[PDB]
Amino acid sequence: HHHHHNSTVLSFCAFAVDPAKAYKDYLASGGQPITNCVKMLCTHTGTGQAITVTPEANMDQESFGGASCCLYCRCHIDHPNPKGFCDLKGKYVQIPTTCANDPVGFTLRNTVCTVCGMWKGYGCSCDQ
């Protein structure tokens, strides 16, 4: 059985003392990723950079509205920095197609190369 409910998951995380860990542990337990991230119409011929002013998905990505892929925005809670600043809100986020089932998890787990603007491990081809 069990019917599933996005709001159940978001409620659980929103009211957790550590929402990021709550979501991470929930996924690790086999939980269904947060759905309904807002997928954009785009050419799929963009730069493939992680977080952009307009959609920039390449052939191997999807572009989504940034806030819809942000755990803190989606939970309607303050962001984890003194300023309360969200890097995603008002922007567009590119998610590799293999991970597009869980954009919120993807943005939580991953980091952007400050040099090339691509996701580390998913686009950055800078020398190591």
Residues 73, 70: Cα–Cα separation, whole Å: 5
One residue of 39, 86, 109, 110 binding Zn ion per CB under 5 A:
86
Query: Which residues have a Cβ under 8 Å from the Cβ of 11 and sit 6 or more positions away?
Result: none
Burial class (CB in 10 A: 0-12, 13-18, 19+), 39: middle
Q: Which is nearer to Zn ion, 5 or 90 (CB)?
A: 90
CB of 101 to Zn ion, least distance (A): 20
Phi, psi dihedrals of residue 61, rounded to the nearest 5° = -135, 165
51 binds Zn ion, rule: CB under 5 A: no
40 binds Zn ion, rule: CB under 5 A: no
Q: Which is nearer to Zn ion, 19 or 55 (CB)?
A: 19
Q: Which is nearer to Zn ion, 89 or 109 (CB)?
A: 89
Binding residues (CB under 5 A) for Zn ion: these are: 70, 72-73, 86, 89, 113, 115-116, 124, 126
